[PDB]
């Protein structure tokens, strides 16, 4: 099955109206200050007060 009529440039944007992106929640590390996405280990391997991995 294929479109018997061409879809205009307006129906295309109406369908894409729901294709927008969402900003992931971010927080501040408590030992170095750089922003990291929430509930994940920072770049220093320091999650909370626990040294997870060696520094980058």
């Amino acid at each position: 099955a294929v479109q018997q009529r061409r879809s205009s440039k307006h129906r295309r944007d109406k369908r894409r109206s729901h294709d927008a992106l969402t900003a992931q929640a971010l927080s501040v590390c408590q030992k170095c200050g750089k922003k990291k996405l929430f509930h994940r280990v920072c770049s220093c391997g320091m999650y909370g007060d626990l040294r997870v991995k060696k520094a980058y």
């Binding site: 294709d19 927008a20 992931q24 922003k35 990291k36």
Partner: protein
């Protein structure tokens, strides 16, 4: 006072780049960098480089404060495409169009920057009408 940075023939498609550019328009400098550094998209580590270069040449070349910069407009214009032949079934063939985007980021220090652009458009219109009136005066003079 707009500072800007450009990148021609970026491999990312404009469709998949506008989705990321709309996440930073109107945002402050530090917050825009923070948002773009933690988004799992391919067109995030390329807009980040362009944004950083734009900040550098705004606070070094054009002499801007640096604590008032906001992303004025970040867009991905359509770039030149590349045509390849994908071999189909039963002897047929189709054309693959590798899409490229011309990325440009622009930041300003004045939060009223749109007004000056409209002002320049108005000035051009006024000069056209002024030319017409001077020509009319010359026609009647003769």
């Amino acid at each position: 006072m707009i500072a800007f940075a450009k990148q021609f023939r970026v491999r990312i498609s404009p469709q998949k780049a506008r989705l990321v550019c709309q996440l930073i328009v109107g945002k402050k400098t530090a917050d825009a960098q923070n948002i773009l550094s933690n988004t799992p998209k391919k067109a995030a580590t390329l807009i980040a480089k362009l944004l950083n270069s734009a900040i550098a040449n705004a606070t070094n070349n054009h002499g801007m404060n640096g604590d008032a910069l906001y992303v004025f407009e970040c867009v991905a214009n359509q770039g030149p495409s590349m045509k390849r032949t994908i071999p189909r079934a039963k002897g047929s063939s189709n054309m693959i169009t590798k899409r490229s985007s011309n990325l440009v980021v622009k930041l300003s220090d004045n939060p009223n920057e749109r007004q000056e652009l409209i002002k320049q458009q108005k000035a051009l219109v006024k000069k056209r009408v002024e030319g017409q009136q001077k020509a009319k005066m010359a026609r009647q003079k003769a």
